[PDB]
């Protein structure tokens, strides 16, 4: 090709080799600290992690010598584009220093936030575990209200003036990088250009999120109405049969998930949940057995075994940081770090983390920067569908953790789907509405004097949730969630959720599965493993739209598979709700 393209290819070839060596060495230090926490290693790992962050800055400068307009090879364009990003470099040194100070202060205000007893001002509670325990386990309306209000008053108010200047500085940075605003900048993770038939604009994400949410509304309104009727028995006299759910009664500090409402809403409380923890301890299962069974599951669909380095290097038990994590260091080195316990949860989590490893192994041959998920939602969606198959009674029988004669009754099935929906479906309105608020704020569509007014109009309208006390514009309730005060995009939790049921339905059709989608186990299906692997090996070398089509046969996000997964619960909920109101009036509030 042309001289500029040839020189770009040569540059990228040298970048990819230099990056592999330094990333392997840098992430090798991360493995030392996270498996052997010492005072030396915190700064020793910083010495390796700072060396890595500066290398990308120098390589970014070198990448700018090759105009993107001259590159015709799309794989080279994709790599140059990721390298040519300026980010906060477009800001003046004063504005970068200010933004970084604001960012660090918001993060610190959140992580040190605490509320104290008004009668005993030295007795204080942190979010974890103190306030979180109240929000999950308290049945005292006023104690829940006190924790919900105090967090937003002590923490959120502190963040309000910081969040205003964060919006200004972030928008200026995004505009200088030729985006419309900071929200438009975040939506760039889904952008696809220059591939005919697979393009995707940044605005299209807003329309696709809003269209798929439209179809979610009937299921969510019926879940909401069922929960609301059950919550009236849990908190008598405090909940209107036609109104929104008071925001402090939802089982965590924000209502991000309804998971902790289960024992207050369980359809058939006498049917216990399927748990194979005891069956595993009885059969003398250890951590080695868990991951070996996980490896057998992936081998069963045509994916490879784990590597010799995996077993040699992975830390599968507490001897460290105990977050379940999958490691992709390069040079054929893959590891899992997990302080495994002999429980059903860790058996499911091990399938999740090895799904990450299978994804990592499949795209290991891609260029350095293309060794990533097709977009921000892909990787966790791949891990989630591994737990879906591994948790079914069907699969638990085949590995001998359920008796061969075990039949799951229809009341136990409804309990499981409802518990699933409280977490999976309950978070979708929350996630879309929060990100919609931020998107509109970044767009300049919500004036500062209406920030909290619009936040709670949108909570009432979209989420069916109402503030138990009025909040003026001294509050910054969004910033009282970690993701907002710590500058993380949120829509990934929406797209990942829809992706995972798109994946599972396609894999289960390929396996020619019979019956309800939620009972499917893709084990021993090489067709499903080949369908999945045709996307896994792409990394992000292809448009995410193409990678999705490789699994499910369509180019776009689709919520119909999620609706299919929950169809048995939807049918049951409509019958439960036949004498209840479905939906809500935004006019009721606990205080007015």
């Amino acid at each position: 090709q042309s001289t500029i393209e040839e020189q770009a290819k040569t540059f990228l070839d040298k970048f990819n080799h230099e990056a592999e060596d330094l990333f392997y060495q840098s992430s090798l230090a991360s493995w030392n600290y996270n498996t052997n926490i010492t005072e030396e290693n915190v700064q020793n790992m910083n010495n390796a992690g700072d060396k890595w962050s500066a290398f990308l800055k120098e390589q970014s400068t070198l990448a700018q010598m090759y105009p993107l307009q001259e590159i015709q090879n799309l794989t080279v364009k994709l790599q140059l584009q990721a390298l040519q990003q300026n980010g906060s470099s477009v800001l003046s040194e004063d504005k970068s220093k200010r933004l970084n100070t604001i960012l660090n202060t918001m993060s610190t205000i959140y992580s040190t936030g605490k509320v104290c007893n008004p009668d005993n001002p030295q007795e204080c509670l942190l979010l974890e575990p103190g306030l979180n325990e109240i929000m999950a386990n308290s049945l005292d309306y006023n104690e829940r209200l006190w924790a919900w209000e105090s967090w937003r008053s002590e923490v959120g108010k502190q963040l309000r003036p910081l969040y205003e200047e964060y919006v200004v500085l972030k928008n200026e940075m995004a505009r200088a990088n030729h985006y419309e605003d900071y929200g438009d900048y975040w939506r760039g993770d889904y952008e696809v250009n220059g591939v005919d038939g697979y393009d995707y604009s940044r605005g299209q994400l807003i329309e696709d999120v809003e269209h798929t949410f439209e179809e979610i509304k009937p299921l969510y309104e019926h879940l909401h109405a069922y929960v609301r009727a059950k919550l009236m028995n849990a908190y008598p006299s405090y909940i209107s049969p036609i109104g929104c759910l008071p925001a402090h009664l939802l089982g965590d500090m924000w209502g991000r998930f309804w998971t902790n409402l289960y024992s207050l809403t369980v359809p058939f409380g006498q049917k216990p949940n399927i748990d194979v923890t005891d069956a595993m301890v009885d059969q003398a299962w250890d951590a080695q057995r868990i991951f070996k069974e996980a490896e057998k599951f992936f081998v069963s669909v045509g994916l490879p075994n784990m590597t010799q380095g995996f077993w040699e290097n992975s830390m599968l038990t507490d001897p460290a940081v105990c977050h379940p994590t999958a490691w992709d260091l390069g040079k054929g080195d893959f590891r899992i770090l997990m302080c495994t316990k002999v429980t059903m949860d860790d058996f499911l989590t091990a399938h999740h983390e090895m799904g990450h490893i299978q994804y990592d192994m499949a795209y290991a041959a891609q260029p350095f920067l293309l060794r990533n998920g097709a977009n921000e939602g892909f990787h966790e969606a791949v891990g989630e569908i591994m737990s879906l198959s591994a948790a079914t009674p069907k699969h638990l029988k085949s590995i001998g953790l359920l008796s061969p004669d075990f039949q799951e009754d229809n009341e136990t099935e409804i309990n499981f789907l409802l518990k699933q929906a409280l977490t999976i479906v309950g978070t979708l309105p929350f996630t879309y509405m929060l990100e919609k608020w931020r998107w509109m704020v970044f767009k300049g569509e919500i004036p500062k004097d209406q920030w909290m007014k619009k936040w709670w109009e949108m909570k009432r309208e979209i989420v069916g949730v109402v503030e138990p006390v009025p909040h003026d514009e001294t509050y910054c309730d969004p910033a009282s969630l970690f993701h907002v005060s710590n500058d993380y995009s949120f829509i990934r939790y929406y797209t990942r959720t829809l992706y995972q049921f798109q994946f599972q339905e396609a894999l289960c059709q390929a396996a020619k599965h019979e019956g309800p989608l939620h009972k499917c186990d893709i084990s021993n299906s090489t067709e499903a493993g080949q369908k999945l692997f045709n996307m896994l090996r792409l990394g992000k070398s292809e448009p995410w739209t193409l990678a999705l089509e490789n699994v499910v046969g369509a180019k776009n996000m689709n919520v119909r598979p999620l609706l299919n997964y929950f169809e048995p619960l939807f049918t049951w909920l409509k019958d439960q709700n036949k004498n209840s109101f479905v939906g809500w009036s935004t006019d009721w509030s606990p205080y007015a």
Binding site: F23, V42, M45, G49, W52, S53, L56, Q85
Partner: peptide
């Protein structure tokens, strides 16, 4: 933590 990303390659 270190990542194959240019936006957030490093977290301590």
């Amino acid at each position: 933590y270190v990542f194959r990303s240019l936006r957030t390659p490093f977290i301590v």
